[PDB]
Design an enzyme around this catalytic site. Structure first.
Site, PDB file in Angstrom:
ATOM      1  N   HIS A 231       8.939   2.254   1.162  1.00 47.56           N
ATOM      2  CA  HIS A 231       8.103   1.456   0.245  1.00 47.56           C
ATOM      3  C   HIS A 231       8.737   0.103  -0.067  1.00 47.56           C
ATOM      4  O   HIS A 231       8.057  -0.961  -0.102  1.00 47.56           O
ATOM      5  CB  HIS A 231       7.855   2.208  -1.063  1.00 47.56           C
ATOM      6  CG  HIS A 231       7.298   3.594  -0.888  1.00 47.56           C
ATOM      7  ND1 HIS A 231       6.326   3.905   0.045  1.00 47.56           N
ATOM      8  CD2 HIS A 231       7.605   4.766  -1.506  1.00 47.56           C
ATOM      9  CE1 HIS A 231       6.052   5.201  -0.013  1.00 47.56           C
ATOM     10  NE2 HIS A 231       6.813   5.746  -0.944  1.00 47.56           N
TER      11      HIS A 231
ATOM     12  N   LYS B  64      -2.703  15.265  -8.018  1.00 47.59           N
ATOM     13  CA  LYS B  64      -1.577  15.524  -7.108  1.00 47.59           C
ATOM     14  C   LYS B  64      -0.335  16.157  -7.805  1.00 47.59           C
ATOM     15  O   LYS B  64       0.637  16.507  -7.127  1.00 47.59           O
ATOM     16  CB  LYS B  64      -1.209  14.252  -6.316  1.00 47.59           C
ATOM     17  CG  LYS B  64      -2.240  13.897  -5.233  1.00 47.59           C
ATOM     18  CD  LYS B  64      -2.394  12.393  -5.011  1.00 47.59           C
ATOM     19  CE  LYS B  64      -1.567  11.896  -3.832  1.00 47.59           C
ATOM     20  NZ  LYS B  64      -2.334  10.802  -3.120  1.00 47.59           N
TER      21      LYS B  64
ATOM     22  N   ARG C 158       3.191   4.706   9.108  1.00 49.87           N
ATOM     23  CA  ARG C 158       4.503   5.203   9.586  1.00 49.87           C
ATOM     24  C   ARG C 158       4.380   5.902  10.912  1.00 49.87           C
ATOM     25  O   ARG C 158       5.361   5.918  11.627  1.00 49.87           O
ATOM     26  CB  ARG C 158       5.166   6.167   8.595  1.00 49.87           C
ATOM     27  CG  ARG C 158       5.446   5.563   7.242  1.00 49.87           C
ATOM     28  CD  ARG C 158       5.794   6.637   6.243  1.00 49.87           C
ATOM     29  NE  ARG C 158       4.666   7.549   6.117  1.00 49.87           N
ATOM     30  CZ  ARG C 158       4.664   8.730   5.501  1.00 49.87           C
ATOM     31  NH1 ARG C 158       5.760   9.234   4.922  1.00 49.87           N
ATOM     32  NH2 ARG C 158       3.526   9.418   5.490  1.00 49.87           N
TER      33      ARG C 158
ATOM     34  N   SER D 299       8.464  10.941   1.129  1.00 48.19           N
ATOM     35  CA  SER D 299       8.763  11.310  -0.271  1.00 48.19           C
ATOM     36  C   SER D 299       8.881  12.851  -0.373  1.00 48.19           C
ATOM     37  O   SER D 299       9.773  13.361  -1.036  1.00 48.19           O
ATOM     38  CB  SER D 299       7.656  10.806  -1.227  1.00 48.19           C
ATOM     39  OG  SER D 299       7.854   9.497  -1.843  1.00 48.19           O
TER      40      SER D 299
END
Lengths: 161, 161, 161, 161, 161, 161
Positions: D20, D44, D93, D131
């Site tokens: 990030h 989430k 990514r 993450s």
């Protein structure tokens, strides 16, 4: 309510493999009539001439009553229109195949809006089979008998030996 | 030589989208009879109850004469066998879809060998449309009218407002 | 705090498509100046000479004030450095595109560390469009008018008929 | 011809990673103003509350003059409209990322037609960093210092130990 | 020059499938010693307790002399270090698998630099087999005998009936 | 229980890259003996003759005691059988690589059932590196020193300048 579904299964079929045979056999069970349609594909410089590829596909589709083998050199969509086909059958062996079929299916929707493209996944037995790698293996005398119908193996071996 | 092709188009359809509608409309043009088959999917905790999803799919498939909407909770393959269907229709919107459909098609070949799985790619208009993202957009009052049939938009908006 | 962002949009553009046009139009709205940069690409044996490709790209980008069309034959990174560009714009139409762009973006980070590569996804209208399949369709007199700007269609048709 | 480009970089950032940080640093060099926009993402169940995630992103973006960190809970598109942003920046990514970003970019074109989505590929140093896997490694006391800014590592370790 | 290669094959194995068995059998032929390592995976809420999964994996790996089955709950990398393993074996069934294994392999290179990750592709017989879809089929009394070793089928059927 | 594992690492290696070197170095640490096997690949028209490619691979693998470099022109599987190798090592740099390796691994299982194919992912440092793009960059005098061993860079530069 019974219907006449006429499908075309187009490709280079250079040569027809056990994978192609599995797909056309399944198409044959599903649709009233199937044209196994062999693209001249001149700019691809095929190993087998169009006539040889037509002959080989006739030998291996002989037992399928509702299948007809035809050579063509126009657009697959114009070929379908010419033969009154309403279904275009294509194989999807993997993800790499998907990209191109998506592009082609969209092109064909523009060229012939009432022609429906439908996709079949080969049996896991045959899904890794690729005319080009089989040809490469055969060039070195590797055993290719698991991947091709018997008459196709015989013609590939003659074409090389 | 005319044939009866009976197809099932199974999914969660929570709710039915313009993408689903495009696929069932195409299936309807190709096959003698289509069952739009709505999986109970209890363990997925759907936004709409099975009855609501059946009602919505009936509203949007009303104009397709040869389509019938049915709720089910067994295996899709047993459902097909129960209804004498010989074709199972699935959508392929992208590459991520392909992995799962390949696994499922192979499972289903084992469970019902004479059931043929066939795949349709939605029109580019609808291909990015995903029930889950539409539901997420609707939760925040975003405009979802381009993605759902009118009665579905109306029920989604009532279910949230 | 206002800035001068100078971007290059490099490709073979053989010929420029509605997809390319959508991307350069979007780049034009975002950056101070855009060079639509046409790679000589000799070893690719393009259908159109570099001059023809430059002329066609000028016709279709005429209305974009801040776009300039230039032919080049060096590395795209050296071209950017030569023209003081800080942004390199590339299109990503699908997953197959991603692999190569990732490799190229990493190469370019080594060759010109302050050049930033940024990616744009074409509108769903144009995303399946591929210069090579359009050229194949045109070779057989298929209708390609949905995929190319009008002057490009006209030059493709002359180049073939 | 100088311009004001206002970009938003939205995500859950739970927590902000070296990946990030690389993206927002690059966005910061390219655009006049960048909002690093942290989605509440309640459904989430994030590891860090929105306030904690805002604080951590402020610590690591402190040196970037033209970056502002803001929490939000509406649609990213409405957030962009609210802040007069014309660019939405997202990271890609890998291939799995591409599917979802394509769907989202198309949704956002419908919701805010003048908002342009642009994609950046992280440096190969950081591209595998996720993450969720970092959080899984940290839960077992594995060393995560290569993947997170120093203050983020410190808060992750406190949040767990 | 003979060597001791000690490999770990870690997974949830809930339950061990014919695919897992094919991989561990191949690992067993290649390496001096293989630990089939069963992750507690508590946060995944497995169908079978760790003890049940260990028992089932012992039954099906009984004939492999150099394979040992062990339950663990730490990081796979720390587990390898604890058991002096220098090789970590993982299966790659498809493209979706690749993304995650790449991320994980890179994480593990950081955590244990001398641990080598190596990948095996299952035989085409088993490659579509997924513990989750098999469990879904079994829940409805579908026949799963082609996908699981006999004692695993028996325990899955008892666990459900 | 110590074992002799004999592995082959076959490729075109035109020229050997830092990526290839990373893989053979890892293979060297894992297996008793490694043959770095250079395919004649005549129909690929390599930049470097087979002898030049053998010489370059010898220079860069000199420090690896258990590695031997050999040129071959038969099938990789027959080459393995000839040299009593039981392991075939291949690199997987990305998803596009996976398709082909899957096809090839399945072909090789048919040709030599006791030859095991195993896959290694290069370090993130080298994973984007592609002999073809490096050659393209070198053709234009771009700096390629980060991607090739020093003697390979020197021979590439001589072969072009």
């Amino acid at each position: 309510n019974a219907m006449i579904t006429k499908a075309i299964y187009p490709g280079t079929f250079d040569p027809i493999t056990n994978g192609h045979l599995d797909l056309v056999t399944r198409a044959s069970a599903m649709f009233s009539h199937v044209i196994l349609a062999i693209a001249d594909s001149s700019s691809k410089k095929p190993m087998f001439t169009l006539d040889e590829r037509v002959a080989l596909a006739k030998k291996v589709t002989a037992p399928l009553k509702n299948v007809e083998v035809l050579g063509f050199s126009e657009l697959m969509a114009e070929f379908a229109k010419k033969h009154n086909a309403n279904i275009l059958v294509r194989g999807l062996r993997s993800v790499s195949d998907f990209e191109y079929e998506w592009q082609l299916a969209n092109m064909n929707r523009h060229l012939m809006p009432k022609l429906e493209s439908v996709f079949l996944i080969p049996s896991e037995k045959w899904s890794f089979i690729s005319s080009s790698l089989v040809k490469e293996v055969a060039r070195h005398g590797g055993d290719i008998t698991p991947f091709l119908p018997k008459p196709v193996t015989k013609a590939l071996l003659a074409k090389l030996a």
